[PDB]
Amino acid sequence: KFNGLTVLPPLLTDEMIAQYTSALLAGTITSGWTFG
Amino acid sequence: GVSVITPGTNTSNQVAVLYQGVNCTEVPSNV
Ligand SMILES: *[C@@H]1O[C@H](CO)[C@@H](O)[C@H](O)[C@H]1NC(C)=O
C-alpha cells in the first residue's frame, strides 16, 4: 500500500463467480427455460 | 483501516475487529 491508498477485495471470489456461471449453464443445458 | 463488526446493540454488546490488510502478527483469544 502507498500513502493512505488501499484496495479492498471483492466479496465474491473468482471461484464463486465461476461456480455461479456453471450452475446457470447446467440449468440451461438440462432444463431449458423452466428453472428460471 | 480498522472496522468493527457488531450484531447490533439490541442483540449484544460483543464486538469483533478487522485490521484491514495487516499481517496479524503486528497488530498491537481468537486471532
Ligand atoms: C429490538 O428491541 C426490541 C425491544 O427491546 C425487540 O422487540 C426487537 O426484537 C429487537 N430487535 C432485534 C433485531 O433484536
Ligand SMILES: *[C@@H]1O[C@H](CO)[C@@H](O)[C@H](O)[C@H]1NC(C)=O
Ligand atoms: C505474516 O508474517 C509471517 C512471518 O514472516 C509470515 O509467515 C506470514 O505468512 C505473514 N502473513 C501472511 C498473510 O503472509
